[PDB]
Structure formats: structure tokens, C-alpha cells
């Protein structure tokens, strides 16, 4: 994740132009290697045509250069790339939306599961840990960064996501599929036990806990789906052949011919095909957006920070269910205790953002006395 | 936010043409500086070509002017800008949709949390204040206007969003991440305490309160997500290079050459490239839509009024949970108490809007007696 | 709202061609004035060129006519108009989807709030009236037709939407923002009072009532949002300049020159630029779709019938909660009381629509005996 | 509804080519009449030009044929048709999604409403019948097929959807709007009565019943909305004029001129304008998709089978709430009662579909011993 | 399903280029037969023109070759294919999203339905089996792979999805429609019986069970809808005629003529029409994406693995409700029992993914002392 939200807060002079001076997550980082290969091939062909070929061979190469230059437009690269990248970006944001957060669940576990004694602490910690464990099991199944951090269940044990007892239980339950679903069943059974043991006072609170946990389950299932059901390989191959064929053709059709023949469109021989390179930049960068985003759980600069999310979820969830359980700030009358229309102040830097309320678009309509009178 | 909803209520003669006479939130305000730089560069190049260059240098410049003018169309600016701005507008409206409003929560807190005594008042005020505090913590994390208004937690204390006790508690809980989630945990624990203390009469009402509060939490999480997960920097750089390369090329390809040579398409030498300027207006304004909307929590004219929303939420929520708690208008028989078919009157200005009911599209189908008869 | 659903039920010969003979909500009604101005300007320019200008001035005008005619295509009107109108149509249908209907709420109020005495009647009527009042307050804030019908809160009192007591209470609560939210708080507190007074038998029914009411609140909030957050004025100005610049250019580039010069594409001098007029019809009508739909609560022919919806909601909701409360048709054995497979008859006009059930796409797959046998 | 799902299960050789040999729901059925009119007009113009016109008149007709042929491309038919048909297809699938099914409701009514006696049977049948009656009232309001089957409420009585008592009650309640909402109010009041009479044991079950019923109400409201709020007539007229103007122009611009003059692009005189006819097929068929789908409740081949859905809903719902109420198959130990890893067999035809489980995309990542070691 | 998620984790050099070396689910596999037919026809026409035709016949064929070559662009294949394939891909992902998973339901059944005795085991197994049976009945109705595995209800009995008693009960209930809905009614009635028998302790838990089961019902209904309501056959025929007409025209317009005549664009006679073949690859592969995805439950390589999902659902659901019922790992203090800020370790391979928390986009805004001061 490369965040530049602060740099584009306002539409200032050359707002997006300042972003062209970024390297991490940059288009340069993504397609400099492909561009170097393309440039090498282009100039190898240029030197072959300019030095090796004979007069008749050079004429036959020139005829093919103008034949290829007329079909470079026959390729509908823009359409294919436009639909495919839109599909990849949609899937990318859905995959983010299906990253599980324990915040709703941890608030309900902190509130509903009672007891300041060791048993209450252990019960709350175990429930939240089940939620975190389910999340990490799916994430290590779908995220290469998380897998590299936890290449085995024993690593999850050493890192504190799973106890040795939980590891043994998981081994006992092993089926020939992903076992990421197990902690949800454990959670449901432990919540039932807590309710029967009086730690959850009412079954409506148990229903709320199970609802939040099942929401997390659905998110983890969606992550499994996106990891398993790739964008059809045929659609990916179609877009790839469009881009590569376009630039393979450009490798010949965009050669600078001998100006002597004075072919139409070859009057002046510049050495660098600047607009060909700009088209490469545009089309290959647009494809590289898909190439980076198609699996957003990899290790690209703009891929999701799954490891950070795992660490932050564990810390936050344990703190909320253990230290913050029935641990509230003192409840005292606030600053506006007897102020009917509170008006919090503005700093000198923010005074310009004070606004009158928008009352609705009809507020300033003017009508005559006769217009406003009800009719029988 | 520049509201013009009232001006476009009806499709009147030149409805959208009257909007070209607006300055605030206008396209002129957004790209006058870039346009001035472009115009300066265009005329500097014009004077260089017309005065400095020699006959042969002028001919070589003219050859490049017609070479560049033929590739200005090779750029697929329309496609790149069309997909990117659609993505930015989608994200912009989602970000609005994820601005938290306490209205549902404050109705449930006003109704469910009982007691006209000081303790009931304090409990209701504290719960609603927790909701407002969570909202303001995330908003100051994502909105430059709100941050400038509350550059520190001490400012939140001085403005009445947070008590000194709440500030101390937040400091005690500090982790190396955003603490905007804390007030939700506080809310859940305080609602549990209110239920156990008899201020909430049934656990179904507590479930309702926690559901509304968790909805606000999810909205605040979405705001955090949009602030953190920028549109991929590669996609932004691709669109930026498309626009800038197009107009850099136009800076040469759209020069007015000497009419003497009588080049095709250069017959008449106008001094102002009116259609080039219109293309600049169109493409750069379309890009400036993205530049303004990509971070809708900045300080642009059309950015969201986060400060107003904060103030209005605090005022409304405190009034609803404190002054309006069990404070109802007298319940008396209405104007249509014994009128089976109430028909509220129309003013002379509104009589034209009285309509017969639409009964469905099948209402006027005509069938014969034999057509309408059931068959055995 | 111009409904033509019945005319397009079937794909008949020239189904959409018969719709070109409609005036109300027609494209003619929307852009006849603009077209008359355009036609007047076009022929004024034609007469100026044909009569006033000298030979050399006419030649200079002709050179500019063919210069302008070559850039009329440089304008990407189709793209700009295509994205903007799609955004406007999406917002238009969302705004419809957020029009509040009391039907769910009124069924729950009719069922749950008990008592055939005057107090039960008054309680049910007051709750449904709160829902209607919230709806009308937001609608008069966002709809010019509703505002013209209720230009003041006193008009709401005279029309029976609000009692004098409710009006006084609203004045007492006045804040410098829209007060459309107040009736929801009133509803929540009155429902709580009804539950505590035994008129609502269980708190689960109170939860259901509050859920439906909060759904209506969310819809009203969405209406407020769409009224307040206009489509960015920059995007509207961009599309407007695209259309107007295109046709300003056409005003010169589409002039019929003197055939004598025999310019390419000016061989025959027709007096009416039929295809220019068709382009005007197309592009300006496509823009007029946005101009009419951008604020669907105005007074255009195809704008929503907010007044009708208000009247119909009041009538229906009062009837459901008052006259239909525990007022059921006699419950008796039906026509198929002992008929295992009911087959309601068809008329002679409908016999053709009787179909066999679709059993699924796999139903007709044929397999051999050996193919169908399970393997160990 | 023309189902071809079975024919396109696999991407076989010429999968979509075999579908060109279908008549029902075919493009031929939809635009053969328009095509015959177009062909007649084209050849009438051909014979007029070839026989009636004089040499000078023929030359003036030829000049107009090449003038019209150059603007046939000026029409942006593809854009207009592409956005409009996408809107129509979106609305078409939403309208399907809002067809009410009693399956959720009938399961809850079968389970929750108790009693094997005549009163329990009558209560369950009456509740499900209310749901079916609401559905049929809206469907006969919006569907021409259903209206033709039930052209009056008396037909609903004769067909068993409504009892004479229900008909009398509906007449007593008559307001000047669609009364499709009434059965929901009846349902809510009858469910309340059943709860108070002990036939529904807990108010949570009553909440579930009312939730499902209100979901059906919302679907029926959406159907009413789509029937009432047509796609703006202006947008429909714009697309219609685009298509018709294009082909009116083609009627002249696509005439085969005399080869003698040897005009560019008229070298060889074929009698049939094959590509003009293919363009007619394409554009008019794309428009006919909208013409058929714009009202999917008509009587086109691909319109929804509303009558079948009505019949199937009545049969299924009555069977589920009456015959299947507490009528369960014997509960006995299953085939895998003591088999920890059940493996249901495969037939010889399905053995090829047995797969190993996908374990996640990270499963095959290989790391060294040192890479896998945790760091302090 | 061909998963390549692991290969595209990172945007590496030629990431998508390595995918062109895949056969299963490849574009080659999908359109090699059509391409062979096209190539055969192209070269048959080439040999006919080059050998059979006389001088005048060859000239007439050449005139038609350049006439056809000018209309190959008149076809708007890109637009038609672009909208249709987007619709097919949307439907494809919705169909995946509506594949039922028992995970939520099985967690609730494992937790809520009590008893370690044989009766509790049998009740839990029977409920989960009802859910699985409903899923398999719909899947065998819509999936050719599942139908081939279970070509009769007797096969479902032999495979253990249905008992002989359940089969007899289904036969007794037979109506002339799909009976996939029956197991939901059975589930609701059996859950009611379990609640009345004390196996479900509270009706809120029964409400939760029925909610999850009804969610599965809605998913199965959506699957039935997508199987029944095909994409309109007219839209499919339109796209098919676009592609086939384009390439039929190319069969003549893309012939290599005799270079002797030196026609424009036919200067050099290459034997293989490389760009025609690339266009075939592009357009026909883009169509083959739709052809494979239009019914994603077939037996294509990229079709869903319905059989695997069926097997995995049965195994997982039975294990969760039977072996894991109240079978929890020992609850013991975790690794961070008294560690306020848990920091799970990183491996040497993952150390690079450790990040500082993102605190929000406003975090680094700098303001002066005077700027930060509140104003009165
Ligand atoms: C192409 C871009 C070049 C840059 C623009 C040229 C400079 C335009 C004049 C300076 C801006 C107006 C002054 C201002 O600061 O204005 C504030 C005021 C309130 O803003 P409001 O009217 O939105 O409310 O606005 C008003 O005086 C009333 C609004 C009048 C604005 C009309 C501008 C249309 C023509 C510009 C293109 C030439
Ligand atoms: C290109 C734009 C130029 C402006 C239009 C030219 C003026 C057209 C005639 C004046 C409008 C009709 C008069 C009217 O006020 O009409 C009301 C009436 C009810 O409206 P309704 O029919 O929608 O129901 O309509 C009717 O008389 C029946 C409907 C007949 C309208 C047919 C117009 C098609 C041709 C126009 C283009 C030339
Ligand atoms: C370009 C448009 C001009 C109008 C069309 C020309 C007239 C085509 C023949 C008349 C229609 C078929 C007769 C019919 O009423 O058919 C019913 C039958 C059932 O319908 P079903 O096969 O969908 O099941 O269909 C069948 O006989 C089997 C289906 C055979 C239809 C093949 C038509 C493809 C070629 C047409 C273009 C030339
Ligand atoms: Ca990646
Ligand atoms: Ca901004
Ligand atoms: Ca309007
Ligand atoms: Ca239809
Ligand atoms: Ca398939």
C-alpha cells in the first residue's frame, strides 16, 4: 500500500504532476525491465535494417514497415484493456472489503462476556483469539507475505496465534481441504458453553455474538473464493496477446526508415520513437495496473499490508476484550451540560470552514401571497 | 460542497448554460493556472519559431510540427480519463455514504435509556458523546479541515468532544495505531452497565443499540480504508502522463505555421488555437474532476463539509438524547380523525401537481366478453 | 412521471417509433427553444455570408468554414456525455429508491399497537403521522412541488400533517439546521411510552417498529444527501462546454458554401443542414436527459410525483393503522381446501400463457446404463 | 422465457453458431417486419433512381447519394444504443430479482403456526394465501399476461386467490389507488391474532414471520415502481431517432449507383447491399433487445412467465403450509453414521470431475530452513 | 476452475506473458477448431482465386476483395462484444456468489442443537443433511457435472445424500415442478420440533437457525433463476452474427491479391494474413470467454467445480455438527497472557513486510502555534 491521500487533498496546481516523481509503486518500477527489452529489440532491428540489409532487402523491409504501420491501429487494445482492468479493479476493492476486522466482534465480546476473574479473562481472550485464528488461517492460505511469515501451523503456535492444544485438535480434525473454517465452529461451541455457564446473561447477546462472528466467516469465505476462482485465464490471455502483439508490430512498423525515399510519414528521421515509447508507457502501464492488482495479497508495493493488519488485529482485539472490559473513563457532566446549542470553537487555521447549515434546495423559492393560499 | 440543486430543478432553456457563470467550484478556478502556463509556453514557442529560427531551422521545425500533429490522436486520453474518473466518482460517493450520522443511534438512545434524573441524563449524553467522539477521531484522521480544527487530542478536550478523564484513559490505552476504535468499546461496555443497572429495561433494546453503534463503526472503518488504500499510484500516473503528454505534443503540433508554404491544414494563420484551448479545457477539466474528488475530505470548494457535519451531529445528538427524552408533543385527535379519505389541500401554486393515481400499466387493456371467460 | 409501460409491453412492429408521437416528456418539448435559437443563428450567419461579405471576405469566411469543419470531430462530446448521463441516471434511480413508503411500518403499527378504544386509535394514528410528517418535512426540503404546496410549517398545520402542539414543540426545538429528523425521535419516545403502557406487548415488537422507522430515516437522510451533494459543478460545466462548443463550431463549419468554388464536401448546396440538425437533436437531447433528471424532484413532466406520493401515503397509512386494525375478512376454507394440486383456471385470452414447469437445464441429458453406474 | 442454458453448458465448436437456428425469441422474429419494410423502401428507391429519373436528375440523386453516404458515420448510434440497452438490461434483471417467492415465508408459516386441527390448517392456509394474493394483485397490475388471466377481482374470486369475504372487505376499503398493499396489513393483523391465540408460541417467531412478509412487500413495491417509473421517454426517443435516422439515411447513401460514372466506392454494382443489411440486423436487433426487455412482463417470447410463477407459488405454498406441516420423513441414522470422512461415489460419466481440494495459492511456495526461522 | 493466483502474486517481468504457455483453460483449447476451419476456408478461397478464376473473373474477385475490405471496419464488433461479455462476466460472478455454503448454518447447528446422546447426534446430522440435500437437488438441476454424478434421486439415495424414507416422502409430495425447495420446509419443521422437544433451548436460537437456512434457500433460488432465465437469446444472436459476419467478410477482404496490379495496400504478397489471424484470436477469444462463462456449471476447464463443493460441504458439515459438537481445545492462558502489546515474530523471509501503522492522511500536517489556537 502506497498512500498519497495527503498529497491530493486539494486540487492544487499540478497536483497529479508532483506524483510523477514517486518511485515506490510507480509505473517506472513496474515496466522498466519490459521497456529496456523493447528498446533493445527496437534498436537491434534498427541497426540490422540500417547496416546488414542490402538495397533490395532494405526496400522489402521498408515495404513491410509501412504494411505493419497500417495494422498497428487494427488492434483494439484500448477496448480489451479497458474492460479487463475495470474487472480487476472491481475485484481488488471487493477483496479489500472482505478483509476481516474483529472490531464489531471485539466490542460485543468485551461487553457481553462477563467476569473480571481469570475465567472471564480467559473466556474473552479465547473467543477473540478464535476470531483472529480463523482470519490468520485464511490469510496465510491466500497471502504470500502471511504464508512466508507463517509457513507452518507450528509457526502459528510459536507466534501465539494458536496454542499447542488447538494445534493438536486441528490435526485430529484434519480433512483434505483447508481447515480455516474450524475456529468458527469452536467459537460457536465456546459461546454456547459461556451462555450455559452464565457468562453470557441472555441468548439475544449470544445471537449478536454469533451474527458478528458469522459475518467474519462470510468475509473469509469471500477471500477463499477470490483466491480460488481466478479471472478466467482465457480473458487474461486475450488481453496479454492484445498488448504484446501491438508492441511486437510496433517493433517493425515504428522503425524510422531512410528519409531519402521520402515515404509519406517518414519525412524526418528522429532516432527515438518518442510517441511509440509513450504508447508503450500508456498501454503497458495500464496492463501493469492489472498485473499488480490481479492478486492484491502478493508482495507488490501497492499490495495489501496483510501482516500489519494481522498484528494490529491481534493487539487491538486482545486489548479491547481484556484490559478495556468494564474499564470505562469516569462518567461526568460534559462541557455543554447546560448549553442547549453547543458550538465547539474553531482554530485560526479552520475558521474558514465554518458554514451555515444547508436547509434544502427549496429554501429560497419565493411565492406571492395569492400563490401561497390553500384552495378549497 | 457547492450546491446548485435549486438551479437545475427543471430542464429550462439553457439550464446548464447559466451554470457556466459560476466561479466557486468552477472549472476556471481549477485549471486557470495550468492554462496560463500552457498559454505562456505555446506563445513562447510561437515567438521562438517566428523570430529566432532560420529558414532551414524553420523548415525543420515545420516538419516536426506536422509530424507531432499526426500523433496527437495516437494518445487514447479519452479512454484512460474515462475509466479513471468513473472510478474516482464511484469512490467519492461511497466515501459520502460512509460518513457516520448518529440519527438512528440517537433515536434509540433517547427512547431506550431511561431516567429523567441527572444519572439518566448523564448516561444518555455519555453514550451519544462516545458515538460523536469515535466519528470525530476518524474524521480528524482523514479530513485536513477537521485536523486543522483539532490538531491534537487536547483540542478535542478544549472543544468538549472529550473529557480530561477520557483523554487520560485514551493515553493509558495508547497502541502504535489509530485509536479511533476505542469509543465503540467504551460504548458497548457502558451500554452493558446501563442494562445491568436497569436503565435499559430489556436485552433486545441493548442489542438494537449495539447494532446501530456497530453500523457507525463499520462506516468509520470504511473511511479509514479509503484514506489508507489510495487509488493505485500506477493508475494515477498513467492518466497523468496521458493528459500531460497530449498537451506537451499539442504545444508543438498545434502551432500556427507560416501560411506561405500552404501546408495542408495550415492555410489560414489564426493567432489563438481556439480548439486546442477547448481540448485543454475539456481534458484537463475532466482530469481536475478526479484531482478534486480523489480526496473529498480536503479543502476544495466541492469537498465535503466535515466541520459542519461534526458540529451539526454534536448539537442534534445532544438535543435528541437530553431535551427530547420522553418530551413529546401533546397527543390529540388529528384533522382527519373521522375522515376516511383524507385530502390535504393544494395552494394555487401547487394545484397543477394534483394527479390521479397510477393504477398499473394493465389498467386500460380492453378484452371482449368471450376473451374474459374462464375455460375448463 | 410519463408512464408508457403499457405501450412497450411487447416488441411489436415499430414499438419505439409510435413513441415519437408523444409531446409530454418529449425531446421536442425539452429542446425546441434551444433548437429555434440555433436555427436562427445558423440562418443569420448564412445570410451574412451570402449577402454582406465581399469576394475576399467570403473567401476568408469559406477558409474558416472548412477549418472549423475539420475540428468539429476533435470534440469528444460522445465520451463526456456518455459518462455524465450514466452518473445522472444512476443517481436518479437511487433517489427514487430512497423515497420513503410507510407500508412496512404501517403493517407493523396496525398489528403490534393494541386497543380498539380511542387511546389505541390515537396512539396508532400518531405514530403513523410521525412517520408521514418526517417524510413530508424532508420532501418539502428537497422537492419544489412539495415546497410550493407547503411553503411554511403553518401550511403543514392547515393541511393536517402537523398539529398546533407539534408545531409549537418544533419551534421550541429549533436549531440552525433542517429539523426533518425530529419526528423520528418523537416516534422512538412514543413507541417506548406505548411499550411501557402495555399497548405494545413485547419489546421484540418494539424493536421491529423502531427498525422499520429507522429504515425510513435512512431513506430520508439519503434524500437530504442527494439534494445537498450536487454532481460536482466542474463535471457539469465540462459536459456543458463540450455540447455548446460543438454546436457553436457547427454554426460555422456546417454552413453551406457557394457550390461555384466546388470545395470537397460542398458540391451541392442544400439549404437545411439535416444531419447537423439530427446531431443537435441527438447530443442536445442526450444532455437534456441529464438536465431533466439531475434534480428529479423539480416540476418537469418526467420528475417524480412527490405530491401524489405524499397524499397516497397519508391516506393509505391512516386507513391501515385505524380502520384495518384487527379488522379482518372472515377466515373460511378456500376453494382448494381439499385439492392437493390446485390449478386456477385460464381465460380464453390467457390460455396461451399456460406452460409446463422448467425443471432445470440438466433435465434432458441422456446417459447410458454403464455411464450411470456408480464406481467403487 | 426461452431457456438455452443446456445448449451452452460447454464452450464447444460453434456453440453460439448453433443458436442462430432458433426461431422463438430469435432476432428474425423480432425485426423481420421492419426489415421487409426497409428492403421494400430500398428497392423502390433503387427502381425510381434507375428508371424514372432523367440524366440530370440522376446526377443530382447520385451527388446526394455520396453526400448522405459521408454522414451515415456522423451518427453515434453505437454509443446511444450501448448505454440505453445496458440500462434496460440492468432494469430487466432487477425486475426479475423483485418477483416475490413465498418459499422463505411458507417455511416459517409451516414451522411456526401450530395445530394439526382444522383451525391450524385454516390459519396457515389463510396466511400463505394472503402472501399469494398480494403477489397476484401487484402482478395483475404490472403484467399483461396476468391481467388477461384475471381481468377483474371477480376472476380472482372464481380462481380461488380470493374469497367472497376478502372481495367484500377489499371493496369496503377501496381508495383511488392500487389496493395491492391490503393483504400485507391483513397478514400482520392475522399473525398478531394467531400469536395472541397461542398458535404462535413466541413473539420472536412472529417477528420472523413479519420480516419475511415485509420482504415480499418491498419486492412488490419495487415491481410497482418499475411499472410506474418508465425509463425517461426522452432517452427512449433519443435512441429511437438515432436508429431510424441512421437507416433512413442508409436508404439513400447505400444505393448502388451506375458503375459507368466510376465513383469512388461504387466500382461494382451488386444488387443486394449485404453489409447495409448486416448493419440493419446488428443495430435494429440491438434496439429490439431493449424493445423486448423494456417491459419484461408483456407477452414476448423472452418475457417472464408470470402466470407459471403464480400457479407454481400457489401450489407449492399451500402444500408446504398444509400437507408438510409437522410431516417429516423418518429420522434415522444415515449412510455415513460412523464414517469420519464421507466419500459419496462417482458414476463412470462423472469420475473425471473428482478433484483434489484447492488448499490456497500459497500452498506450493518453497522456503529454505534459514528463511523459515523466526527472528528476535 | 484453473487457478493461477500464485503465478500472478507479484507484477514481475512478463508476469502475464508466462501465462501464454498454459493449455488447460487456454484460448488455444477454446478456438483451435474454429481457427482451423477459418484457415482451411481462407486458403481454399486463396487457391480458387489463384488457380481456377480467369483474368476477368480474377479482376471481378479483386474488385470484391477491395469492396469487402472497406466494410470490415463498418462492423461494430468491439462494442457489441464489449457490452455482452461484461454482462456474462457479471452473471458468472453472481452465480458463484449464490453457491450455497453450510458453514454459517453448521456452526449454529453444532452450537445450538444440544445433546451428546444418539438423539442429539441424529438431530444435528439430519438438519445439516437437509441443508446439503437442498443444495445438491438444486445443483443437480443446474449443473451438468452434478447431474451426470446423480442422474436420478435413487443415485442420491445410493450416495447417502438422501435416505429411502426421504425419497419416499419426496415421491409422495411430487408436484410438476422442481422439488428442490422441500428440504427447507423439512428443516423448518424439524427445527421447530427440536425447540419444542428442548433440544434448542431458546426461540432466539431457532430464529438464528431459520435465518441462516433461509439465506441458503435464497442462494439456491438465485441459482434456479440464472439457470432458467438465460441471457436473452436475441442479444446472444446479435453478438454471434457480429463476430461471424466480421470473419466471413475477412475471408474475402483479407485475401492477398496479385501484387502485379499494385493495388493500394496489396503491394507485397505475404502468404499468411498474420494480423487477420491476430484479430481472429482477439475477437473470437473474447467471444469464447462468454461461450465458456455463459453457463458456468458445465464441464469446461474454467467452469465451477460443483462436485468438489458438494463433497467438501458434506464432509465439513457432518464433521462440524457431529464430532466438533461441544468438543473444544483445552482453554488455557495464551502466549500474550500478561503482554499488553503483543508482537508476534517475523521469519527472515517476512521481516521486510513489518510496517509502521498508517495513522491517517492528516498525521504529518504542520501548523504554527498561532494557527493552532482556538478563537472566541
Ligand atoms: C478559461 C479559464 C481562465 C480563467 C478565468 C478568467 C477570469 C475570470 C474572472 C475572474 C473570476 C471571477 C472573480 C471571483 O472571484 O468571483 C467571485 C464570485 C463568487 O463566486 P460565484 O459567482 O461562483 O458564487 O463570482 C462572481 O463574481 C460571479 C461569477 C462570474 C464568473 C464568470 C466566469 C465565466 C467566464 C470565465 C472564462 C473566460
Ligand atoms: C424538432 C423540435 C421542434 C419543435 C416541435 C415542433 C412542434 C410540434 C407541434 C406542437 C406540439 C404539439 C402540441 C401539444 O401541446 O401537444 C399536446 C398533446 C398532449 O401530449 P401527448 O400527445 O404527449 O399526450 O400532444 C398531442 O397533441 C399529440 C402528440 C403529437 C406530437 C407530435 C410531434 C412529433 C413531431 C415533432 C417534430 C417536428
Ligand atoms: C433476416 C430475417 C428475415 C426473416 C426470417 C426469414 C424466414 C425464416 C423462416 C421462417 C421461420 C421459421 C418457421 C417457424 O415458425 O419456426 C417455428 C419452429 C419452432 O421454433 P424454434 O426452432 O425456435 O424452437 O422453428 C423451426 O422450425 C426451427 C428453427 C429454424 C429457423 C432458422 C432461421 C435461420 C435463418 C433465418 C434468416 C434467413
Ligand atoms: Ca499483486
Ligand atoms: Ca479534494
Ligand atoms: Ca428535474
Ligand atoms: Ca416485453
Ligand atoms: Ca460453461
From Swiss-Prot, chains A, B, C, D, E:
Principal subcellular localisation of the protein: membrane
A single GO cellular-component term on record: membrane microdomain
Keywords of this entry: Calcium, Cell membrane, Chloride, Chloride channel, Disease variant, Ion channel, Ion transport, Membrane, Phosphoprotein, Retinitis pigmentosa, Sensory transduction, Transmembrane, Transmembrane helix, Transport, Vision
GO molecular function, one term: ligand-gated channel activity
Result when mutating residue 92 to C: In VMD2; no effect on subcellular location in transfected HEK293T cells; loss of cloride and bicarbonate conductance
Transmembrane segments: 31-50, 60-81, 237-254, 274-287
Cell location: Cell membrane; Basolateral cell membrane
Record note on what altering residue 104 to C does: In age-related macular degeneration
Free-text function comment from the UniProt entry: Ligand-gated anion channel that allows the movement of anions across cell membranes when activated by calcium (Ca2+). Allows the movement of chloride and hydrogencarbonate. Found in a partially open conformation leading to significantly smaller chloride movement. Upon F2R/PAR-1 activation, the sequestered calcium is released into the cytosol of astrocytes, leading to the (Ca2+)-dependent release of L-glutamate into the synaptic cleft that targets the neuronal postsynaptic GRIN2A/NMDAR receptor resulting in the synaptic plasticity regulation.
Record's protein name: Bestrophin-1
UniProt lineage: Eukaryota, Metazoa, Chordata, Craniata, Vertebrata
Amino acid at each position: 500500500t502506497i498512500t498519497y491521500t495527503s498529497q491530493v487533498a486539494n486540487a492544487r496546481l499540478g497536483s497529479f504532476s508532483r506524483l510523477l516523481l514517486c518511485w515506490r509503486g510507480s509505473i517506472y518500477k513496474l515496466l522498466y525491465g519490459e521497456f529496456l527489452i523493447f528498446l533493445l529489440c527496437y534498436y537491434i532491428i534498427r541497426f540490422i535494417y540500417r547496416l546488414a540489409l542490402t538495397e533490395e532487402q532494405q526496400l522489402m523491409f521498408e515495404k513491410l514497415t509501412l504494411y505493419c504501420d497500417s495494422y498497428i491501429q487494427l488492434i483494439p487494445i484500448s477496448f480489451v484493456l479497458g474492460f479487463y482492468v475495470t474487472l480487476v479493479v472491481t475485484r481488488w476493492w471487493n477483496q479489500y472489503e472482505n478483509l476481516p476486522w474483529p472490531d464489531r466482534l471485539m466490542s460485543l465480546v468485551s461487553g457481553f462476556v462477563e467476569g473480571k476473574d481469570e475465567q472471564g479473562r480467559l473466556l474473552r481472550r479465547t473467543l477473540i483469539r478464535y476470531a483472529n485464528l480463523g482470519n490468520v488461517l485464511i490469510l496465510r492460505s491466500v497471502s504470500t507475505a502471511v504464508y512466508k511469515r507463517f509457513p507452518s501451523a507450528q509457526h502459528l503456535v510459536q507466534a501465539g496465534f494458536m496454542t499447542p492444544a488447538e494445534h493438536k485438535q486441528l490435526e485430529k480434525l484434519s480433512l483434505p481441504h483447508n481447515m480455516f473454517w474450524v475456529p468458527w465452529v469452536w467459537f460457536a461451541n465456546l459461546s454456547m458453553k459461556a451462555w450455559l455457564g452464565g457468562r453470557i446473561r441472555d441468548p439475544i447477546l449470544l445471537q449478536s455474538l454469533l451474527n458478528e462472528m458469522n459475518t467474519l466467516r462470510t468475509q473469509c469465505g469471500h477471500l477463499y473464493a477470490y483466491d480460488w476462482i481466478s479471472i478466467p485465464l482465457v480473458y487474461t490471455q486475450v488481453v496479454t496477446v492484445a498488448v504484446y502483439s501491438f508492441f511486437l508490430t510496433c517493433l517493425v512498423g515504428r522503425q524510422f526508415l531512410n528519409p531519402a525515399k521520402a515515404y509519406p510519414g517518414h519525412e524526418l528521421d528522429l532516432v527515438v520513437p518518442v510517441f511509440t515509447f509513450l504508447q508503450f508507457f500508456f498501454y503497458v502501464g495500464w496492463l501493469k495496473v492489472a498485473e499488480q492488482l490481479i492478486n492484491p495479497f502478493g508482495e507488490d508495493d501497492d499490495d495489501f499490508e496483510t501482516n500489519w493488519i494481522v498484528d494490529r488485529n491481534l493487539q487491538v482485539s486482545l486489548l479491547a476484550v481484556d484490559e478495556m472490559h468494564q474499564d470505562l473513563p469516569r462518567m461526568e457532566p460534559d462541557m455543554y451540560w447546560n448549553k442547549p446549542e453547543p458550538q465547539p470553537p474553531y482554530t485560526a487555521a479552520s475558521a474558514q470552514f465554518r458554514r451555515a447549515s444547508f436547509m434544502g434546495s427549496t429554501f429560497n423559492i419565493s411565492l406571492n401571497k395569492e400563490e401561497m393560499e390553500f384552495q378549497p
